[PDB]
RNA sequence: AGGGGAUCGAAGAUGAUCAGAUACCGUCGUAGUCUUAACCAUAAACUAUGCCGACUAGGGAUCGGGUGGUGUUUUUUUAAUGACCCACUCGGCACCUUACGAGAAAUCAAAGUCUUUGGGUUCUGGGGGGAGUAUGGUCGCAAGGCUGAAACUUAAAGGAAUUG
RNA sequence: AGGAUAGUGGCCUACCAUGGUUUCAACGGGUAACGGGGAAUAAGGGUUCGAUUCCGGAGAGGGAGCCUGAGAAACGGCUACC
């Protein structure tokens, strides 16, 4: 059933540590513990081994990603701008 | 003007009114007869063909669809029916 | 009717004040007491040759259809030998010179003589109080198609 | 009109007054019927059958040329689709938009269009399940809909 | 069964029995309706080419 | 959308006579509209009128003889008894002597005058004076 | 148009809509909420006795200028400390504290009339004898 | 909450004016302004004109589509083809003149077809305050939103126009 | 299915099943509510009132129980508690 109205994954903490702090972890913890699509086999099997290590259950390719996500927003835009720099060198 | 015969309007007014706003709505669309000059097959072409239809003989475009009355090919003969 | 474990309860169900003597053996070998409900309500055949008892049946039971006759659609058939019909009608408000669709949910006692379904219009007749909330027995299933013959799925 | 829009266009088809085949027609009722079926054996919409008839041949309106109207003959001839056409292309339209939203999260405009497309689907389905072209309780599940339109 | 509502083996077997009989009544009408579609319309479709252009039109009114 | 064709019909006739047009176009002109105009026409409020018979419920051209003053509808069609019709006439008509209240009845569509004489009543389509 | 359902079977909506809009009255809201019976010095009455406890010189409102010679009467039936006007010339010498007087409404169902602030009652009798008669010197207020 | 954080910039510092000026003005400057994920759910969110339908008046404009033109224009001077023009036409944003009509008028082509009152339907208001307050419920992290009185107080509050 | 009743009936008891009503307003609350015939006002439509001359219900300080009796849960009958 709908076991918790709003706490969700943070409900393991009971009543303690403050609602705002528990809300911040509730955001980053669902994002940390979600399966993620793999960029090489195309199936949602990427898990987080350690902080920043993202191992796909199949094809065993591990990607160095963010601590709590396979791809941070900063890393995404850096990859885009590195591409922008390489296009002007190659064109 | 307070007086006019709606039953008997001028045929010009019928031609100058919307195809459905008129006394009895009737299609302003008609049909064609198109002969491909290279062959001897006739075919009924709707005025608003809406498709690039080819004659049953060969895959030659005899008309081009457009907004309203479909365009007809340059190299063909059309006959109103 | 002539099946479905009629004697499935504790006590033996039988039309009272009748007996079938084992001394004489006839062709039918059985005796079932029925009657015409009345008011031009011809008895359905499944009551004539039935096997259920349903003491409250207008035909095979001890209850008589005397009083009024109602008509309405069926909204729930999900109780034993009793359903609820919604006798929708119109109430005339005198001030506004207008009607309002007001409804009453009438529960009625159905004998197994009738296969009664939701939507199918039925006519019922007042009787001796069957239960706390029931006072009417289904007496004819008003069915040309019954909202089921041409509106339910065909495989 | 346009119950999901403010537009009030009146564009439609104004069929002629005459209730019979025009003088210049050549083919017979069987000839047009046999032409319709093979168009449908290709896997065609009765809307497409009618428009393709109007162009390939001079069949102005198949119901007038025949004694019976288009989808009427197809169900008699055994080509009746599992679900009605206009419902079907609504279903395909709904899944088209729905897959668009999964990839495009921030397309709020298309999200709003989705509920309008579904509103149309549900009102059509409610009507169909009374006429019983659709079996009762035939529900637009929104989950395995793509199975119905491939 | 991974979800609830099969409280024991007998409950599952009695559900299978119902479901099998439900489909086997469904298949009873499926073959029966499929019979009529194959039978009633198609069997007299050859009657058109048989008799409609045979009697009352061509032979008796020919001499 | 369109809910009562006769409502739009007599609303169109009302606008026509107010401007003074001697003829008016009415559509889609159901048979309750024709029966309504028969009642008015025989009494002389309207004259000639033509029912163009197309297969889309048809259209009506009415010749207004400048004699009609106002023809209206009483929607909804109130179920009026044989007795309350006099209350209805007194509320709706500019005077007792003239003017008509149109009723559809078991015996057809007729004014409030021969509704009394036929001793039949029913619903109220509207009025004409 | 007209923004009301004219349909023949719309009676339920008409009555519900009218029954909600009747609450925008002043009289109907008072009658249905019973504000006379609940929150009013008189429990839906017209007259009520009481005791004159002290005298108030109630300065009038603008543009007038006068002392209105009201009396602070507490009503026996509910104890409410209300102010009662004393009509007619004098008539504040005729009454004193710890008398018993009969009050009446002030002519406006609340909403004190004239240039009198907050006094919605006028004294009619005193010592069981009409203050009108006392003003005309027909009777004499007993010392009781 | 994360990134971003150039400009502008609540708060604040400030220098002026001022009788006071922690306001207007000037310099700087925080949150914010930007974005992603969640919220909030209100605005003079206004055309202060619910939505759908018909009819009633004339016009010239313009936008999108369609139609007709041995109409003009473009490498070749009816010979390879769009745009423009004229006449229509549907739909749109509106606009102008008059109001038959309406309205308290201002004004309105709908705010008309409403005391000759009824096309269908939803919502809202019932003098002004008290008061969108209290209370209660509900949604929100909160700011608050939605729903929402009364006592009491008052003879006005207000609209549009006229004269000064 | 039985018990009880003058009889019907979840009226009660056992067993069985999950039913019943609801935005057409159930349920809960308020009533300065006994219901109706009627009263006042009344162009029509209505509004308000209807404790009160008649009909019906309920009560006899408040609940509860019961005898006699055709008829009472009676009260110018009784018993108990308050």
Swiss-Prot record, chain A:
<dbReference type="InterPro" id="IPR050522">
    <property type="entry name" value="Ribosomal_protein_eL43"/>
</dbReference>
<keyword id="KW-0479">Metal-binding</keyword>
<comment type="similarity">
    <text>Belongs to the eukaryotic ribosomal protein eL43 family.</text>
</comment>
<keyword id="KW-0863">Zinc-finger</keyword>
<dbReference type="GO" id="GO:0002181">
    <property type="term" value="P:cytoplasmic translation"/>
</dbReference>
<dbReference type="GO" id="GO:0003735">
    <property type="term" value="F:structural constituent of ribosome"/>
</dbReference>
<dbReference type="GO" id="GO:0005829">
    <property type="term" value="C:cytosol"/>
</dbReference>
<dbReference type="GO" id="GO:0022625">
    <property type="term" value="C:cytosolic large ribosomal subunit"/>
</dbReference>
<dbReference type="Pfam" id="PF01780">
    <property type="entry name" value="Ribosomal_L37ae"/>
</dbReference>
<feature type="zinc finger region" description="C4-type">
    <location>
        <begin position="38"/>
        <end position="59"/>
    </location>
</feature>
<dbReference type="InterPro" id="IPR011332">
    <property type="entry name" value="Ribosomal_zn-bd"/>
</dbReference>
<feature type="modified residue" description="Phosphoserine">
    <location>
        <position position="39"/>
    </location>
</feature>
From Swiss-Prot, chain B:
<keyword id="KW-0687">Ribonucleoprotein</keyword>
<dbReference type="InterPro" id="IPR000592">
    <property type="entry name" value="Ribosomal_eS27"/>
</dbReference>
<keyword id="KW-0862">Zinc</keyword>
<comment type="subunit">
    <text>Component of the small ribosomal subunit (SSU). Mature yeast ribosomes consist of a small (40S) and a large (60S) subunit. The 40S small subunit contains 1 molecule of ribosomal RNA (18S rRNA) and 33 different proteins (encoded by 57 genes). The large 60S subunit contains 3 rRNA molecules (25S, 5.8S and 5S rRNA) and 46 different proteins (encoded by 81 genes).</text>
</comment>
<dbReference type="GO" id="GO:0022627">
    <property type="term" value="C:cytosolic small ribosomal subunit"/>
</dbReference>
<dbReference type="GO" id="GO:0005829">
    <property type="term" value="C:cytosol"/>
</dbReference>
<dbReference type="GO" id="GO:0008270">
    <property type="term" value="F:zinc ion binding"/>
</dbReference>
<dbReference type="GO" id="GO:0006412">
    <property type="term" value="P:translation"/>
</dbReference>
<dbReference type="InterPro" id="IPR023407">
    <property type="entry name" value="Ribosomal_eS27_Zn-bd_dom_sf"/>
</dbReference>
<dbReference type="GO" id="GO:0000462">
    <property type="term" value="P:maturation of SSU-rRNA from tricistronic rRNA transcript (SSU-rRNA, 5.8S rRNA, LSU-rRNA)"/>
</dbReference>
<keyword id="KW-0479">Metal-binding</keyword>
<keyword id="KW-0689">Ribosomal protein</keyword>
Curated annotation (Swiss-Prot), chain E:
<comment type="subunit">
    <text>Component of the large ribosomal subunit (LSU). Mature yeast ribosomes consist of a small (40S) and a large (60S) subunit. The 40S small subunit contains 1 molecule of ribosomal RNA (18S rRNA) and 33 different proteins (encoded by 57 genes). The large 60S subunit contains 3 rRNA molecules (25S, 5.8S and 5S rRNA) and 46 different proteins (encoded by 81 genes). eL19 lies in close proximity to the binding site for eukaryotic initiation factor eIF4G.</text>
</comment>
<comment type="function">
    <text>Component of the ribosome, a large ribonucleoprotein complex responsible for the synthesis of proteins in the cell. The small ribosomal subunit (SSU) binds messenger RNAs (mRNAs) and translates the encoded message by selecting cognate aminoacyl-transfer RNA (tRNA) molecules. The large subunit (LSU) contains the ribosomal catalytic site termed the peptidyl transferase center (PTC), which catalyzes the formation of peptide bonds, thereby polymerizing the amino acids delivered by tRNAs into a polypeptide chain.</text>
</comment>
<feature type="cross-link" description="Glycyl lysine isopeptide (Lys-Gly) (interchain with G-Cter in ubiquitin)">
    <location>
        <position position="20"/>
    </location>
</feature>
<feature type="region of interest" description="Disordered">
    <location>
        <begin position="38"/>
        <end position="63"/>
    </location>
</feature>
<protein>
    <recommendedName>
        <fullName>Large ribosomal subunit protein eL19A</fullName>
    </recommendedName>
</protein>
<comment type="similarity">
    <text>Belongs to the eukaryotic ribosomal protein eL19 family.</text>
</comment>
<feature type="cross-link" description="Glycyl lysine isopeptide (Lys-Gly) (interchain with G-Cter in ubiquitin)">
    <location>
        <position position="60"/>
    </location>
</feature>
Curated annotation (Swiss-Prot), chain G:
<dbReference type="InterPro" id="IPR006032">
    <property type="entry name" value="Ribosomal_uS12"/>
</dbReference>
<dbReference type="GO" id="GO:0003735">
    <property type="term" value="F:structural constituent of ribosome"/>
</dbReference>
<dbReference type="Pfam" id="PF00164">
    <property type="entry name" value="Ribosom_S12_S23"/>
</dbReference>
<dbReference type="GO" id="GO:0005840">
    <property type="term" value="C:ribosome"/>
</dbReference>
<dbReference type="GO" id="GO:0006412">
    <property type="term" value="P:translation"/>
</dbReference>
<dbReference type="GO" id="GO:0000462">
    <property type="term" value="P:maturation of SSU-rRNA from tricistronic rRNA transcript (SSU-rRNA, 5.8S rRNA, LSU-rRNA)"/>
</dbReference>
<keyword id="KW-1017">Isopeptide bond</keyword>
<keyword id="KW-0832">Ubl conjugation</keyword>
<protein>
    <recommendedName>
        <fullName>Small ribosomal subunit protein uS12A</fullName>
    </recommendedName>
</protein>
<dbReference type="GO" id="GO:0006450">
    <property type="term" value="P:regulation of translational fidelity"/>
</dbReference>
<feature type="cross-link" description="Glycyl lysine isopeptide (Lys-Gly) (interchain with G-Cter in ubiquitin)">
    <location>
        <position position="55"/>
    </location>
</feature>
<dbReference type="InterPro" id="IPR005680">
    <property type="entry name" value="Ribosomal_uS12_euk/arc"/>
</dbReference>
